[PDB]
Amino acid sequence: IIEPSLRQLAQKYNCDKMICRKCYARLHPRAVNCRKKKCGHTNNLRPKKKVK
Amino acid sequence: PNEIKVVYLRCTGGEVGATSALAPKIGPLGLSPKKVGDDIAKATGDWKGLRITVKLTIQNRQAQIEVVPSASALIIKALKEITFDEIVNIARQMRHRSLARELSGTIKEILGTAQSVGCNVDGRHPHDIIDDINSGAVECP
Amino acid sequence: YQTFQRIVENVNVIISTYGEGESGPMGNIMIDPVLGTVGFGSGLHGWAFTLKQFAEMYVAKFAERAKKVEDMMKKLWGDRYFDPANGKFSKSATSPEGKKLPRTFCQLILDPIFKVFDAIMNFKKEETAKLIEKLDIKLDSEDKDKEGKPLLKAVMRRWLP
Amino acid sequence: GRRPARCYRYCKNKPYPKSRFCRGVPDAKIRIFDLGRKKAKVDEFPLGGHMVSDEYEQLSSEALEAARICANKYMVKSCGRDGFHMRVRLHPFHVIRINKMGMRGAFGKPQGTVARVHIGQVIMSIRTKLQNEEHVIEALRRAKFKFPGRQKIHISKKWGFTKFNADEFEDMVAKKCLIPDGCGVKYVPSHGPLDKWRVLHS
């Protein structure tokens, strides 16, 4: 029953992000390369899946 | 509201069907027609077109005048059973002529291109007509 | 008040769209707090109320008994506002000076309940004392010694069965 | 059922083709070497793209088949089923043996076929429309992952699969130094009988 304006506010920090395909790292929505060296800064990124 | 205004459209025509028509889902909005109104709804919209025949219906208390918006592919498929050069011209005459048109060569081109699905005048697809538009290009006004 | 309005609106909208038997064969069926068809309370805490009891007691503190309380029944619900400093109702959303006032439902129904709940819940002993006599509720056994939520359990039940 | 390709990667065994001495050889995995429009004449496909392999290794027959399929799926999907012709320019002629389970009489029996490549040698060829160059490079780039070694993509200066350069191809065809038939062209030297010059050029 969260009001939608605060609902979008929370999704900005919890849901709207990109995930590295090699190390599952949570990256900002505009990320093109993973920031972690454990995967070698791979560009294999995917959006975080929605609950819809 | 014009003593009734239940303007909604419907995408059936040709064969009456009635039950095969989507009218039961669209019936409650007017609350007038029901099954008897549906039967008279297809009566005038029986022929021309014999096809999808999308119509915009203006209400008449219980009756419903079935004026059909002259859709391009609707009239093209209705006429096609083929030159129809003058017939495509009259088909390009009665409809509203908005088209974001400027002249009569424009509408001859735009309506000419819409009928690519069902060819055009005898042995030529309706695109090589579009380039050299001179014959009757100003015959409507 | 908002969530109460949302629910009754949600109940009314679903009554009308499927209950096609509107004014006609059974008349108007939709529930309405002003009509008295909706009540508030909590079965766990054994206390409940509706707009009648508050309107009935406000007149008592204020045959013919029926007509006068149904008009105040109307005043309690809705967007009608009440000014405490003026000590009267008002349809304007703001006072003549410019002080916006609470609506009538929250002002004269919920405030005493909110005052009752907060006083007992926070163990403000003197406030419970002044409240019970201002509310004129009979004191039975086993509550003069037990405080807190069980006391709130008792005073609400006794005041509003 | 098949050993890793690393066991037969290197050309170290003195070419051993299927012959009257090497009998009982199983059939190679790759039987088709030309795909796409093998009938396009010479002109609609002037762009030729090659996969040259800069390593002296041998590629197996199943790898050649796998890369051919991989290039066919992409070229059909992107350029269309009729917009390209593919030619695998490698044939798995060398036969590799296996000594099945000690070292006495260790000469193995045939088990598969490989193709031996050199530093400069095309593995695959694609001819297509000119505007499909990016699609050809990508299709070759993907098929390169199916081979053990390192390979390069090269857009050849020659017209399609023809051995003559694309810039001068049109004008010798114009003056009839080349006549087109089939997928390629016929060179016409000016040193035959004169009657054959006059059935041409007329």
Next chain:
Amino acid sequence: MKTILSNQTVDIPENVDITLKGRTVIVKGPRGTLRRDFNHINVELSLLGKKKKRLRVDKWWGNRKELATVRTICSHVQNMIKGVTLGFRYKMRSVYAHFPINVVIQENGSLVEIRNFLGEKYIRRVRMRPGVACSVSQAQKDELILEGNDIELVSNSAALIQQATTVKNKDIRKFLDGIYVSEKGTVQQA
């Protein structure tokens, strides 16, 4: 490749006054003082005019790794300037699905008290950075106003509150509740 020189300049308003002690910038704006040393980098800092008061940094043979620090310093100095003329105010709302999040602001706005987060009995106490004061606003139903002069301290304290209310072992695409930064503005709105 080493550039001959990479430099850029920042303007200093009339009200705020900047003094230099080596690579240590001190700002004396109306809302207090801000001081920050930069001796971890090798640049030169200079005040240019006496009337327009321009602060200039140079790099003098840096590669692109340390060329990036020229505008990092100037951005920090601008943050110092804005922090002493307008201050930093980080409004942040508390969103909850079912359980209201009760925040109690203890002594002089330096300690905040997150009570009913997801209906747990554990009280979360987070201490604001020195020079950062948090408060409960009266304009909105539930949101924290933490103001200050240092953006690094104010934003870090806002991060302390946000990371304190983190849902564990649940689907965080649901259970979206917590306290998050809504807007980052200033004071005096000028």
Next chain:
Amino acid sequence: DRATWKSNYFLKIIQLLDDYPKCFIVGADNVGSKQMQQIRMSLRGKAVVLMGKNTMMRKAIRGHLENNPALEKLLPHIRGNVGFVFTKEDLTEIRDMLLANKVPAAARAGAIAPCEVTVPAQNTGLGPEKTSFFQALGITTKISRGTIEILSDVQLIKTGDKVGASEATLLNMLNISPFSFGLVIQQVFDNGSIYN
């Protein structure tokens, strides 16, 4: 085709600006293409509306019109989203005819609202399934005659604020026209002259 198109626009602005001596400098505000589509048609009998990049205009009528000066006064005026309406008839008529051709624009989500609109207490006529929209904005509505009813007139949107996403769609269903605006003239031109 980029070089051809850019040159063609140079020819178009050249051979049309030679013909029409009267012009208005007109700004393209939040103006839909469909509603520009009809004004172009609506003025098609009287004038012609042409514009493009303001840099395109600036280089067009500064370097190729040394033959006919007095259009240099257009140079400091063609700024921002600006346009030319090229007319041959009297300026006053096409002025009010432009003002007469206004559009009842809807409310797009994210757009600012310079005008104030507030829904009164009337029977909307909408079915008993759209209550949840009035729930989202806090309007207390009980249904009468099988139709949604606004009990008391409630403020809808104030000037100079952001339209809510659920708010903007609500105005569409109510069919009530929100803030609406279209083509607006700024300056005028006739043989080296400027007015309001």
Next chain:
RNA sequence: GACCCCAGAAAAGGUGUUGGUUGAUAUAGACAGCAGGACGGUGGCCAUGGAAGUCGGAAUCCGCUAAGGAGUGUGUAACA
């Protein structure tokens, strides 16, 4: 990381930095940002339980145009 034999590594990746090749855009104002518009025939044809630009088979036009794909993705049962 650190020296023939030699005592340890591959395919494959990096928006970490350095050099190189090739191509392209850009005062007729690029790039990136912030802000507008992003239309009609046409809910284009055949498939349909409903497929309206976006599950698919094909076709790939016209007019207004500064420009707008008979559609890049999200989204819907379809819309929106």
